């Protein structure tokens, strides 16, 4: 599996047309205070097709 | 049940508030495929299974 190719899994809002967004800050998916740490409802925002 | 004979619950005719599951941090995992867990509280379905 090739893990070099990436997609953003989730975002706080939709991209505008031709908007480019490279930021990798930890996504708060729920009530958890994520504080920049991986865990329950606290996710790295990119994913790979592998 | 034993995994060779897995046990299915029919869910029908009720409101599916998944938010208790979103906050159920005792889950050693809560993966989803095809759909994001946080989106589920916006949805509707004919039948649901567990």
Swiss-Prot record, chain A:
Changing residue 50 to S: In strain: Omicron/BA.1. It comes from the Viruses. Residues 1-50 are annotated as: Receptor-binding motif. Residues 9-44 are annotated as: Disordered. Changing residue 6 to Q: In strain: Omicron/BA.2.12.1. Disulfide bonds join 34-42. Changing residue 29 to V: Increased resistance to neutralizing antibodies. Changing residue 32 to K: In strain: Delta/B.1.617.2, Omicron/BA.1, Omicron/BA.2, Omicron/BA.2.12.1, Omicron/BA.2.75, Omicron/BA.4, Omicron/BA.5, Omicron/BQ.1.1, Omicron/XBB.1.5, Omicron/EG.5.1. Changing residue 37 to A: Increased resistance to neutralizing antibodies. Changing residue 14 to K: In strain: Omicron/BA.2.75, Omicron/BQ.1.1, Omicron/XBB.1.5, Omicron/EG.5.1. Residues 2-10 are annotated as: Immunodominant HLA epitope recognized by the CD8+. Binds to host ACE2. RBD also interacts with the N-linked glycan on 'Asn-90' of ACE2. Cleavage of S generates a polybasic C-terminal sequence on S1 that binds to host Neuropilin-1 (NRP1) and Neuropilin-2 (NRP2) receptors. Interacts with host integrin alpha-5/beta-1 (ITGA5:ITGB1) and with ACE2 in complex with integrin alpha-5/beta-1 (ITGA5:ITGB1). May interact via cytoplasmic c-terminus with M protein. May interact (via N-terminus) with host bilirubin and biliverdin, thereby preventing antibody binding to the SARS-CoV-2 spike NTD via an allosteric mechanism. Attaches the virion to the cell membrane by interacting with host receptor, initiating the infection. The major receptor is host ACE2. When S2/S2' has been cleaved, binding to the receptor triggers direct fusion at the cell membrane. When S2/S2' has not been cleaved, binding to the receptor results in internalization of the virus by endocytosis using host TFRC and GRM2 and leading to fusion of the virion membrane with the host endosomal membrane. Alternatively, may use NRP1/NRP2 and integrin as entry receptors. This is Spike protein S1. The gene is S. The chain holds residues 447 to 496 of 1273 of the full protein.
């Amino acid at each position: 599996g090739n893990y070099n190719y990436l997609y953003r899994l989730f975002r706080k809002s939709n991209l505008k047309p031709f908007e480019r967004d490279i930021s990798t800050e930890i996504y708060q998916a729920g009530s958890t205070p994520c504080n920049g740490v991986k865990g329950f409802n606290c996710y790295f925002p990119l994913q790979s097709y592998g | 049940a034993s995994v060779y004979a897995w046990n299915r619950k029919r869910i029908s005719n009720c409101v599916a508030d998944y938010s208790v599951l979103y906050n159920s941090a005792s889950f050693s995992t809560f993966k989803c495929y095809g759909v994001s867990p946080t989106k589920l509280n916006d949805l509707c379905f004919t039948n649901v299974y567990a």
